[PDB]
């Protein structure tokens, strides 16, 4: 889950604070919504749940260019990881993300180890260009804040938050 200040990427360059989606959402609530949001690719998909998870310890992931998102320790963001030497997309939890890591950013809102790597469908998802791989600068505590998340109909179970790629959730 992520803090209320987080901007969800809506189609046509639009966006909205995740706390503004169901204004006055009760803490620890399940909320049915009907909202088009951008997926990991800039394609519109359906969000049909707005979750208010209540007060949780949160942490701010900040990149070296100053992109940032604040969320819980168990919040999954899409990162670019070296598995064998093959660069690949894995979900790291915020509590396991550390400096030098590379966050995947959806450029629609604004490739390390790949050239040393060279299997074209590989460097086509990556060099898709609708992406951007930002080096993490820090992950610092941010006290206890109200957090939110969405349920999406997308097939990758993802949606955009502050340019970051966040993972679908089924409950608050």
């Amino acid at each position: 889950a992520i803090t209320g200040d987080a901007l969800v990427a809506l189609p046509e360059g639009e966006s909205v604070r995740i706390a503004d989606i169901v204004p006055g959402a009760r803490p620890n609530s399940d909320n049915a919504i009907d909202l088009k949001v951008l997926d990991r690719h800039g394609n519109p998909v359906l969000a049909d749940r707005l979750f208010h998870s209540g007060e949780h310890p949160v942490y701010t992931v900040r990149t070296v260019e100053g992109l940032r998102v604040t969320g819980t320790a168990n919040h999954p963001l899409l990162c670019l990881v070296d598995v064998a030497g093959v660069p690949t997309l894995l979900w790291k939890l915020i509590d396991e993300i550390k400096p030098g890591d590379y966050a995947v950013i959806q450029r629609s809102a604004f490739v390390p180890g790949l050239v040393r790597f060279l299997a074209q469908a590989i460097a086509d998802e990556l060099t898709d260009g609708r992406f951007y791989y930002a080096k993490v600068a820090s992950v610092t505590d941010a006290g206890v804040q109200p957090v939110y998340s969405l349920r999406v109909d997308a097939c990758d179970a993802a949606f955009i938050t502050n340019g970051f790629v966040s993972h679908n959730t089924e409950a608050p």
Binding site: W91, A157, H167, T169, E170, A171
Partner: peptide, 4 residues
């Protein structure tokens, strides 16, 4: 994480 996925469940939430």
């Amino acid at each position: 994480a996925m469940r939430y």
